[PDB]
Amino acid sequence: QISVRGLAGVENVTELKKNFNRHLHFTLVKDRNVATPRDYYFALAHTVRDHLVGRWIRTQQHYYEKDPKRIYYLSLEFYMGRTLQNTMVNLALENACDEATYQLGLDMEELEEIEEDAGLGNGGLGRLAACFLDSMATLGLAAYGYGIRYEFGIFNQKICGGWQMEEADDWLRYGNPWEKARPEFTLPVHFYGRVEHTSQGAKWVDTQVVLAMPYDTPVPGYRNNVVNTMRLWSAKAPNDFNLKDFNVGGYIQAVLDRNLAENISRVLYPNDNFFEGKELRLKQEYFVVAATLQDIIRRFKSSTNFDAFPDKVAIQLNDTHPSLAIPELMRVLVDLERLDWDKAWEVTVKTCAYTNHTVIPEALERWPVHLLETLLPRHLQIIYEINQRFLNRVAAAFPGDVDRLRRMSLVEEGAVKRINMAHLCIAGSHAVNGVARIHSEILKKTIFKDFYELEPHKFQNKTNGITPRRWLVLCNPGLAEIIAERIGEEYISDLDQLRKLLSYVDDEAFIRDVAKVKQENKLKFAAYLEREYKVHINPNSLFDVQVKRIHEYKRQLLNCLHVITLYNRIKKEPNKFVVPRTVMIGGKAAPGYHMAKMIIKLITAIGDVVNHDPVVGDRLRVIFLENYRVSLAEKVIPAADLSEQISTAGTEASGTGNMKFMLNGALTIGTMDGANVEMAEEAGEENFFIFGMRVEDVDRLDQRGYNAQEYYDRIPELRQIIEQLSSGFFSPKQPDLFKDIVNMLMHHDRFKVFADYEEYVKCQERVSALYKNPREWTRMVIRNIATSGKFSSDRTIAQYAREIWGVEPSRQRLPAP
Amino acid sequence: QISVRGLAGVENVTELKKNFNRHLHFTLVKDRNVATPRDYYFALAHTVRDHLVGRWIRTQQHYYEKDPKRIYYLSLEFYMGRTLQNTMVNLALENACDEATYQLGLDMEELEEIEEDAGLGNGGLGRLAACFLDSMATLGLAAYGYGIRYEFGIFNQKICGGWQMEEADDWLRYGNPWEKARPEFTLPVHFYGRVEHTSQGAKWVDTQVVLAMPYDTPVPGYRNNVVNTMRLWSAKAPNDFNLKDFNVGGYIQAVLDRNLAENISRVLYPNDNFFEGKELRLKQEYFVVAATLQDIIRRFKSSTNFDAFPDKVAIQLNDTHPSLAIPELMRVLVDLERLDWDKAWEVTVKTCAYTNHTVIPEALERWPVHLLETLLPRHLQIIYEINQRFLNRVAAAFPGDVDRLRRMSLVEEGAVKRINMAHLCIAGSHAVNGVARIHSEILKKTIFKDFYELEPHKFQNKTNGITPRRWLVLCNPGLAEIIAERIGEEYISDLDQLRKLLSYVDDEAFIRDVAKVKQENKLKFAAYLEREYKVHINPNSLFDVQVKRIHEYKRQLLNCLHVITLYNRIKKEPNKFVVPRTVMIGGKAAPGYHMAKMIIKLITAIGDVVNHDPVVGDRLRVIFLENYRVSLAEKVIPAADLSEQISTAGTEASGTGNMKFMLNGALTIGTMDGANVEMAEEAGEENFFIFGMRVEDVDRLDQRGYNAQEYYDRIPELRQIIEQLSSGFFSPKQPDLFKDIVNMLMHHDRFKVFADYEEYVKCQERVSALYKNPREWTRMVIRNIATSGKFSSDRTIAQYAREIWGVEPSRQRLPAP
Ligand SMILES: *Cc1c(COP(=O)(O)O)cnc(C)c1O
Ligand SMILES: *Cc1c(COP(=O)(O)O)cnc(C)c1O
Ligand SMILES: CC(=O)N[C@@H]1O[C@H](CO)[C@@H](O)[C@H](O)[C@H]1O
Ligand SMILES: CC(=O)N[C@@H]1O[C@H](CO)[C@@H](O)[C@H](O)[C@H]1O
Known about the structure:
Rossmann fold; Pyridoxal_P_attach_site (chains A, B); pyridoxal phosphate binding (chains A, B); about 800 residues; binds N-acetyl-beta-D-glucopyranosylamine; homodimer; ten-stranded mixed sheet; pyridoxal phosphate (chains A, B); carbohydrate metabolism (chains A, B)
């Protein structure tokens, strides 16, 4: 039992064992003779859950009594992962439960592996929302996460014949012990219908009604007894009209068709940085917004002058997905509360804040007018009015600038009329932020330049972060322990204290412990790999890892080119020494993203060749990590030596995986993109492996005109690789299998893979040179870990609180349980 | 607190209050400040449930140890109603819980009204299965009820403008504390596909797979610590093929289409005594049978010579709904276990028993061959083989009788080929029974005459019954108490002891108590009527009740004719004295049964006229009891004076509502149909109000030819009624509203309403004459209650056990909890 895992004191262990047996009997209705590992997992989950309830109830009672300003984080994604260990960590019950289960003859770590991941997110955006919820609770903010309870989260990825196969993530199959259904708080949501203009105001009538049933999940802060709530809405059909609309096609059919309204919360769209304008997605977006706003207003009216609304409520929009909150708030205030437009607008603007997460054009939401027209007629009218008044403001500030007017319009003209949701968000929010310094600057200099010129005060930066609880203490206890031994435990909730480790960079003892922990993590992971999936990696090789969603801008393809280069160099000089490497690439491709699926096949195709070449031996291995998800991230990241963050400069808004690797003892090879810039700034550029074009360089190349052929003609090693791909060297039975990839690299590569190839290969050689010197590699690692403090989501949330929401974070512990 | 409700002893009450608060806090996550009545209901339900778990686990462990013969009751319907009070009654916790909640400042009776009915049945057939489960547990049989967990049970009936409106019964909305999901025991069910004949046997391949997930509900016996199980299957789509069948229409659509396989357990077909040959119904029937048989075999292989199978297993088929169990058992034994046909057939016949519940032709299941052909190709082949071998047996016993062969064939020739499931059941079962003596005789003399001649030994009778726990102790505690005061509590599990009450028929004290209880029940119900539904009945009037499903054979129309007769007689002689009556009619009509819906409208239309006629006053009231269901039956039956059981002789197989009224102190007016015959036999015909044609009389009339016109021409009062209906007297704004009803009564009444009119009216006059003499009315009531013992489902189950299943019932209490 390690120090940071809490105390396992007599009374506690005895009490836990007692309650464990209680739940196994009464809750699961089983006895020790027929109980399976899953039964034991659930008995433990219910036992831990019990310790959470008391504090959950008083935290909420507390907010009712003190009535502080409330923060509502709206997101269509919350990538939570597993909850058991995280709950134990935050409640300081890990060692007690470990002992209690040990005495019951059970291995707690094998029980934890039974829990299903709550994968209600695609990647970075969804996981950021999860880290934020943790930090808001740890900082004592009266915050509520609001989203959708998808019955099917991100699909489980299977690799068959080297190809990605998708299968439904039935995560609720065995039940979810963490959520609490609150059917009593069900709210109605309206769709379709038409607008009627009456004597006093407009009325939205003849609508289809769908019920929103909330499920609450507790979010515990770190050892402060604060337990906030994440409320997820589930779609339910009403019992009437969805059957009472008589004169029709039969009783049975009417009941079966209920699964037409309930499909709204059925599944998560599996896209990462890609907009898909489907009606079902729009319905989901309005569903979460409509239900949430009614809940917010209801809670407020308990706290009718809405002038104080902005003082008691803050609504944060995670991307444009929940952008309809702006016109919906206006609708309720104008149509239902009967406030004058101007007054309602003032309240709305002061209440909403918008966070932008990307500059990629194919990721921006632009909804066709005909869709909004049919599904939400009243909102479309409100949007037109907002646009009209906004453009009048622009025209007054920039007289005669007619092109500026069309550029800033919320309504985009063309083949099909569309509403630019990003423009909607900027107009209706008092604050707009990017997620990394370089991203926020790009927003002001390019994409939102016109808006910045009109309202410079709205634009801000809030560099992303990750929670040190899940991403250090939970997944890397070994490291957290050796750190605690030197500087105490205070850093867990004050990551900046990791800087104290700088005075240990020359400590022979510490250097040895740091390296020891990494080695243990690698052996641990190397074992998991065989135990599950039967694979052959060598724990002595350099663990080169690139895990994140598969996307062309992420450039998994550049990594592939390097891997093939290494392979060719070995075959050319077989008996020459090279630092052994285990290259691991993992990530999911969106089901309808062809090129992404082709990239996965190439990676496995390369492994098929490299992993079975006698001459290579155990000097180079290429493994594709199947079903990359939060729980897998918690295993591979602590075991990594090299972190690949190689997106084309200017494409990765921030990145968060980069921060996770830095905190866990891996060195980083990457481009000056997103948060990589600030990470290098914090650690010192001489302690980072930076390469490739900077944003300025990419722009030059575009002015010039990118011609991949040039690089192909002047770089022999690159030419060889392309010829191997084209000739079928990696696909014997299908010679032209990778023709699309080659065609893209050569004629229409929007991300300039070839442009950074030479610089990349050279930088990688420097990485291999340092790995040869264990002591110096580890000292550089220490300098990275020691300067990763700025990337704690606690820092990020404290900035949102003070600069956007107008609330003060607190580390004060709540009056016990 | 009344005696029969158990003890409320210090330690128990203290413990219950403690656990109540425990669940309210930890389970519901609420505190006394925000808890609603529903929250309190759930805290109490979980508290009572806890006392059930211990015994449930040891009962099952007990069956595993002693390995007795097991009884499997297969039914597509289980009309359970509410579970809270029933559980308390059977565990002897009613007074303790009453006191415990009282001390917590809560009214337990108002909490009980919050529980939703588990309406997984249509009427008599489904409720019989529920009473049987109770009796099997009370008699210590190792029995399991197997059915389907419909997410939508029988629709909730609303009356709008006098018409029936249907709305979805979302009974699981707030959760079900009584069931326990057992996802670990999920089993696959196959559909479609094709048959392949290989070297060694036939193979069913290329099928669609649907998963069957079981949910277990505890069934406690009466104070014997026995807790049996009712396992209900829920449909689940697999995560693969229902997504892995690549090369198709999109990821999102594939996930949404999962609600194509899961629709199997979505809703209960709302038909009572009416066959609807839809594919979805056939899928439900096979779904329950396939999942159940695999579960049975699996449990057996734990108990490979299947020769002992019939000694360890008994399968009871409730009607033909689960008839596919016969060919499915053969399929598994022949195709999977590789037993020779003859051996497999011997086992199947000795294992299965069939109970027939009706002789109405439109209720008999006859599935089109093309349906079975496409959905279950292997089963169709097995059915043909069974038929072939059965007909060879018939041909050998009755040489040259070619018409007998076509009459007995399982395959029905004609416009469309169909399989007669009843013939299938008789051929593949070792016992076939009717549900009342007269019904069982009709089966042998008519419908199944040919089969009886071939195998006389298979035909039996098992008169239906009702459980005295729910239908006396639970719904009429007042009566159970005054009975217990005189003869003890032993009768609750030995109803025959009620005969001792015969020696109290002249007891002035008892006569007074009996009448007092009825009066209290009527006041109680008269109040409920106003509290809910705002209505005006008078507690001093005779409560004339007819509650059951609306159907032409049940003759609610004959009752209507009498009601109109009374009304007309009053209008003719306003100032003449007549015994005051409150006529109550209630019941649901199947959504697609036009005539049934028209009958409901007529009843309310009559009330509209009669209830607002100044001259009538409070002498006659016509009320339509909305949403008749089990919970409503528990309220109205104890309050009834007159029970209407007036089906056309030979149409009501047994009836069970008739038994409920008899046990609760109501006199009966009825035809010699179903169990009415045996009830009159037991009580003495001079203590029953019998009228109308007997079965023999109906047959004569059919030989003759039924001509309604004759009765219309010779009965002035009847003529007047028909003319009032035709002229629009009961539908002013729609003069011909009831044209269909009149047309039917006059030209195509299959149930001869007019033929029994005169006899009915006269009998009703005799009922009014006796009601005028309180003392004599009550003495006759006592003679009915005292002779209702034979109708306890404990008697019924004991007979099934000894004469069909080959097992001995036991009243021995299980070794405590
Ligand atoms: C942290 C995380 C991400 C984000 O990784 P990036 O490299 O920033 O894209 C994606 N998926 C999972 C499961 C994560 O844990
Ligand atoms: C007992 C019962 C029935 C059966 O009544 P019959 O008059 O035999 O048709 C039908 N419905 C409910 C809810 C019952 O309690
Ligand atoms: C649309 C979307 O998911 N954008 C992503 O948001 C996360 C969290 O801010 C960033 O780290 C990532 O670089 C950016 O691509
Ligand atoms: C098909 C069907 O529901 N038949 C019914 O079965 C119940 C229970 O046996 C009988 O009481 C009733 O008279 C009979 O009509």
